[PDB]
Amino acid sequence: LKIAAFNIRTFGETKMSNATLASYIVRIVRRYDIVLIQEVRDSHLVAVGKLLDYLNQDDPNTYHYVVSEPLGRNSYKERYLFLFRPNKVSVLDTYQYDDGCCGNDSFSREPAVVKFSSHSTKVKEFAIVALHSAPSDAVAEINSLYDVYLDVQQKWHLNDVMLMGDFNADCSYVTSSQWSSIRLRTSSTFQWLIPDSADTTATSTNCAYDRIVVAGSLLQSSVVPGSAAPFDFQAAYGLSNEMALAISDHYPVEVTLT
Amino acid sequence: DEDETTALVCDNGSGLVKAGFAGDDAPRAVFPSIVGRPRHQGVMVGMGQKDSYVGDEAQSKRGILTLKYPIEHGIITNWDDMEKIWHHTFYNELRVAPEEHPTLLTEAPLNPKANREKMTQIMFETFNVPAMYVAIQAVLSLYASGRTTGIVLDSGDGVTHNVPIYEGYALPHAIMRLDLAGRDLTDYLMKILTERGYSFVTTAEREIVRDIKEKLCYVALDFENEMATAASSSSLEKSYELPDGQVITIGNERFRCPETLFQPSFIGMESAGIHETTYNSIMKCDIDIRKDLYANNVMSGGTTMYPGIADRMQKEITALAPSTMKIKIIAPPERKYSVWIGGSILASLSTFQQMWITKQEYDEAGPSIVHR
Ligand SMILES: *[C@H]1O[C@H](CO)[C@@H](O[C@@H]2O[C@H](CO)[C@@H](O[C@@H]3O[C@H](CO)[C@@H](O)[C@H](O)[C@@H]3O)[C@H](O)[C@H]2NC(C)=O)[C@H](O)[C@H]1NC(C)=O
Ligand SMILES: Nc1ncnc2c1ncn2[C@@H]1O[C@H](COP(=O)(O)OP(=O)(O)OP(=O)(O)O)[C@@H](O)[C@H]1O
Ligand SMILES: [Ca+2]
Ligand SMILES: [Ca+2]
Ligand SMILES: [Ca+2]
Ligand SMILES: [Ca+2]
């Protein structure tokens, strides 16, 4: 099971209209059995529409989706899209975290939470919590995911949860001293898979902004050691610096279960 | 009250449904006449798999569904998808149970006998309404303007019609239908606005050309020396701010769009236009009734709302009609709901009770009963 999280900058109608860009997004997406795509700025859903026409042009069911409604206190919004190969996993259930929206709401873009059922892995059921944090707010939000993990446990009585997305978790947005205030980091319930080492930006910066975090004893026993890493599509696909960034300024972070 | 409160009025259109309770002044529910069917398998967060979508959820989610219009040119073309729009209207939009509400429905001008019998079959046999009634649309528009004889120019989203009515009976052989309406009109503006050097590229650009048409479009009288005026370039121009900053300017085209209703030639249509058609309807009627029709040109429909439509029509038919005649173009302000309001009045009326087709009439006479 190859799982990944991919922030495609401004995935939209326009981005899907370039053929060259569209072909590379489709090719990346086809490396994964479960993919989360962030920064889905698609109002009518036309762009998600095009992306699935491409994935499903020859079997109608190569991929099935889960999509949020648009999200943002900010009010310039984006959605969460999961796309999974239905022959590999099923979606048992789903909900949008209730962050308090007022003034209190803990997140810019409330995690969509999706419970999967997998039969070829050691973990047979597990939830995936999705987050693209407001960079400005990164420290409070990676910490409030501790509370979304606790909700998945109340609601679904599930320990094996994966939390992933673009956490803006490094460089200026979270520093060495701030980590000490993120429960998601301090609680040894959670194993962080993409280290603080990792560069997950397509631009010149080096930051491990993009994370995959696993709690659950069985989920942690299913992660194939050392498969968790970013995907350098520029380096893999020989792209230029110009082309690579035209896809996104970020790289997928993937992991493999077994 | 039993049914004083209880009568429903549903006006089925080519673009919009208008619905609500007889008694109200305006429709409680207005929404697109679409039924979306998802192109792929999947779900929204927190919802289950949905087989179908109707109205605004079909419009909003249009990128993953195949949209379909049940009513082509005012006539119901797909009965599976129409029963879906009705279901949505009762249960979700008005949130009523239909089996205890009398339902007044509307049909189009020369609606095939068989359809009026079919929607009766579906109203009584799949929705189990107590009683129902089908009114002709132009006829409710006229009546909502107080009168009983006049000629209605009715124009909405997919059809335009002229329905001469005399003491309530719409005159079959004098009715004219022109298949060019507000839908056609938004797509023509689209091109004269891209042709002004623009791009309605994403779907958030497409949709708002229609909101430009509604807000800024005009029907000028003397459309001749209005183009001439455009050229001297007066402060006739009008800039609209898009979803974002992108201030688009529309000076002139603003009225080139409703000049399409008088000149179908602007759009490769060879048919005659609105005013000539008003007139031709009229020289197809009895002679003795033509002074009546001329002093009672009632307008209804979303596309007849373009300001100065009435003045242009006023002068358009004065100058075709014999000078001994009195011309009079009535265009009320609520006209985008005339049809509905005429139904609300009629169905809440004290004397209408004895025309309701009841399940007693139906179970005993077959669909023929309401067909008249
Ligand atoms: C979508 O993809 C590419 C990447 O964003 C778009 O442009 C790329 O980068 C340059 C600048 O647009 C393109 O070449 C240009 O050619 C003109 C013609 O002489 C020149 O004036 C510029 O200096 C520039 O060199 C190039 O085609 C393209 N890169 C690649 C690898 O294709 C491209 O325009 C997009 N296509 C569409 C349909 O939007
Ligand atoms: N202010 C306005 N100016 C011009 N066009 C308008 C305006 N308001 C609504 N319309 C147009 O009228 C159409 C909707 O009107 P209407 O409800 O009369 O049609 P309908 O009943 O759905 O269809 P049919 O053609 O079958 O009667 C759309 O094209 C809409 O843009
Ligand atoms: Ca929020
Ligand atoms: Ca980098
Ligand atoms: Ca680092
Ligand atoms: Ca109508």
What structural domains does chain A harbor? 1-258 (3.60.10.10)
Q: Give the C-alpha separation, B289 to B296, whole Å.
A: 11
Q: Taking the CB of residue B278, how many other CB atoms lie within 10 A of it?
A: 26
Whether residues B202 and A86 touch (CB distance < 8 A) is answered with no
Q: Give the C-alpha separation, A32 to A183, whole Å.
A: 30
Ligand 1 atom nearest residue A243's Cα: 4
CB A210 within 8 A of CB A5: yes
Q: Using the 8-state DSSP alphabet, how is residue B125 labeled? A: I
Amino acid at the residue A162: M
B3 CB-near residues (< 8 Å, 6+ apart): B101, B102, B130, B131, B353
DSSP string, A34-80: EEEEEEE--SSSHHHHHHHHHHTSSSTTS-EEEE---B-SSSS-BEE
Contacts of A13 in chain B (CB under 8 A): 202-203
Nearest to A203 by CA among A250, A254, A135: A250
Whether residues A47 and B61 touch (CB distance < 8 A) is answered with no
Question: Which member of B45, B59, B203 has the closest CB to residue A96?
Answer: B45
Which tokens belong to B271? 């048919």
Please state the φ and ψ torsions of residue A146, each to the nearest 5 degrees: -65, -40
Where would I find the beta strands (DSSP E) of chain B? 8-12, 16-21, 29-32, 35-38, 42-44, 53-54, 65-68, 71-72, 75-76, 103-107, 131-136, 150-155, 160-166, 169-170, 176-178, 238-241, 247-250, 297-300, 329-330, 357-358
Which tokens belong to A37? 């795509």
N- to C-terminal Cα distance for chain A? 6
Q: Which residues pair with A163 in a beta bridge?
A: A129, A213
Q: Which helix (H) or strand (E) holds B85?
A: helix B79-88
Nearest to B75 by CA among B165, B21, B136, B31: B136
Whether residues A44 and B60 touch (CB distance < 8 A) is answered with yes
Q: Give the C-alpha separation, B242 to B209, whole Å.
A: 10
Q: Give the C-alpha separation, B194 to A237, whole Å.
A: 38
Which residue has the least CA distance to atom 12 on ligand 1?
A242
Q: Give the C-alpha separation, A165 to A175, whole Å.
A: 18
Q: Give the C-alpha separation, B204 to B57, whole Å.
A: 16
Whether residues B45 and A14 touch (CB distance < 8 A) is answered with no
Q: Give the C-alpha separation, A172 to A165, whole Å.
A: 18
CB A79 within 8 A of CB A130: no
Q: Which residues line ligand 2 (CB under 6 A)?
A: B 13-16, 74, 156-159, 181-183, 210, 214, 301-303, 305-306, 336
Where would I find the beta strands (DSSP E) of A123-236? 125-132, 161-166, 191-192, 210-215, 229-230
* Residue to probe by mutation, ligand 1, list A21, A50, A239, A240, most atoms within 8 Å of CB: A21
Q: Using the 8-state DSSP alphabet, how is residue B91 labeled? A: I
Which tokens belong to B259? 């000049």
CB A52 within 8 A of CB A63: yes
Contacts of A42 in chain B (CB under 8 A): 63
Q: Give the C-alpha separation, B95 to A103, whole Å.
A: 33
Nearest to A230 by CA among A217, A249, A243, A216: A249
In the Cβ-directed half-sphere of B283, how many Cα atoms lie within 13 Å? 9
Q: Give the C-alpha separation, A52 to A255, whole Å.
A: 23
Whether residues A43 and B44 touch (CB distance < 8 A) is answered with no
Q: Which residues pair with A164 in a beta bridge?
A: A130, A212
User: How open is the CA angle B78-B81-B87, to the nearest 5 degrees?
Assistant: 135
Amino acid at the residue B143: Y
Contacts of B200 in chain A (CB under 8 A): none
Q: Give the C-alpha separation, B12 to B23, whole Å.
A: 18
Report, as residue numbers or ranges, the catalytic residues of A.
Answer: 78, 132
Question: Which member of A12, A42, A67 has the closest CB to residue B45?
Answer: A67
Owner of token pair 């072909």? A23
Which tokens belong to B344? 């609300």
Ligand nearest to the backbone CA of B75: 2
* CA–centroid distance, residue A58 to ligand 2 (Å): 40
> Which residues of B sit within 8 Å Cβ distance of A?
39-47, 59-64, 201-204
CB B287 within 8 A of CB B322: no
Q: Give the C-alpha separation, B192 to B277, whole Å.
A: 26
Nearest to B304 by CA among B282, B283, B275, B326: B275
CB B10 within 8 A of CB B89: yes
Q: Give the C-alpha separation, A115 to B209, whole Å.
A: 42
Q: Give the C-alpha separation, A52 to A67, whole Å.
A: 12
User: How open is the CA angle B335-B341-B346, to the nearest 5 degrees?
Assistant: 140
For chain B, say whether A236 makes contact (Cβ under 8 Å).
Answer: no
Please state the φ and ψ torsions of residue B286, each to the nearest 5 degrees: -60, 145
Which tokens belong to A147? 């509370």
A186 CB-near residues (< 8 Å, 6+ apart): A179, A180
Contacts of the segment A231-235: beta carbons below 8 A, 24+ positions apart = A231/A4, A231/A28, A231/A31, A233/A24, A233/A28, A233/A202, A234/A202
Q: Give the C-alpha separation, B323 to B51, whole Å.
A: 60
Q: Give the C-alpha separation, A40 to A50, whole Å.
A: 13
Q: Give the C-alpha separation, A220 to B166, whole Å.
A: 82
User: Helical H runs in chain A?
Assistant: 13-17, 19-29, 46-55, 138-156, 183-186, 217-222, 233-236, 241-247
Chain gaps in chain A, named by the residue before each (C–N > 2.5 Å): 101
* CA–centroid distance, residue B212 to ligand 3 (Å): 33
DSSP string, A238-253: T--HHHHHHH-SB--E
Measured between CA atoms, how close is B39 to chain A, in angstroms? 8
Q: Using the 8-state DSSP alphabet, how is residue B52 labeled? A: -
* CA–centroid distance, residue B49 to ligand 3 (Å): 25
In the Cβ-directed half-sphere of B5, how many Cα atoms lie within 13 Å? 4
Resolution (in Å) of the shown entry?
Answer: 2.8
* CA–centroid distance, residue A164 to ligand 3 (Å): 18
Measured between CA atoms, how close is B40 to chain A, in angstroms? 7
Nearest to A138 by CA among A106, A167, A100, A96: A167
CB A212 within 8 A of CB A229: no
Q: Taking the CB of residue B75, how many other CB atoms lie within 10 A of it?
A: 17
Ligand 2 atom nearest residue B210's Cα: 31
Dihedral sign computed on CA atoms, order B207, B212, B214, B215:
positive
Measured between CA atoms, how close is B204 to chain A, in angstroms? 8
Owner of token pair 């005026």? B229
A159 CB-near residues (< 8 Å, 6+ apart): A153, A215, A216, A217, A218, A219
Q: Report how far apart, in Å, the C-alpha atoms of B161 and of each of A192, B155, B277, B336 are.
A: 69, 6, 9, 15
The full set of domains in chain B, from first to last, is 4-34+71-134+337-372 (3.30.420.40), 35-68 (2.30.36.70), 136-181+271-332 (3.30.420.40), 182-267 (3.90.640.10)
Q: Give the C-alpha separation, B297 to B269, whole Å.
A: 24
Q: Report how far apart, in Å, the C-alpha atoms of B188 and of each of B175, B198, B242, B276 are.
A: 26, 14, 19, 21
Which residue has the least CA distance to atom 1 on ligand 2?
B214
CB B356 within 8 A of CB B104: no
Mapped onto helix, strand or coil, the DSSP state of residue B315 is helix
In the Cβ-directed half-sphere of B215, how many Cα atoms lie within 13 Å? 11
N- to C-terminal Cα distance for chain B? 27
Q: Which residues line ligand 1 (CB under 6 A)?
A: A 18, 20-21, 242-243, 246
Cβ-count burial A198-224 (b if 16+ within 10 Å, e if not):
bbbbbeeeebbbbbbbbbbeebbebbe
Whether residues A43 and B203 touch (CB distance < 8 A) is answered with yes
Sheet holding B65-68, edge to edge: B53-54, B35-38, B65-68
Owner of token pair 């207005």? B30
Mapped onto helix, strand or coil, the DSSP state of residue B214 is helix
Which tokens belong to B310? 């009435």
Where would I find the beta strands (DSSP E) of B196-353? 238-241, 247-250, 297-300, 329-330
Nearest to B296 by CA among B309, B308, B313, B319: B313
Whether residues B61 and A112 touch (CB distance < 8 A) is answered with no
Question: Which member of A45, A80, A94 has the closest CB to residue B64?
Answer: A45
A201 CB-near residues (< 8 Å, 6+ apart): A207, A209, A249, A250, A251
Where would I find the beta strands (DSSP E) of B259-344? 297-300, 329-330
Mapped onto helix, strand or coil, the DSSP state of residue A84 is strand
Q: Give the C-alpha separation, B220 to B306, whole Å.
A: 9
B349 CB-near residues (< 8 Å, 6+ apart): none
Q: Report how far apart, in Å, the C-alpha atoms of B167 and of each of B139, B284, B345, B346 are.
A: 10, 17, 17, 15
Q: Using the 8-state DSSP alphabet, how is residue B326 labeled? A: P
CB B359 within 8 A of CB B130: yes
Which tokens belong to B182? 């507000």
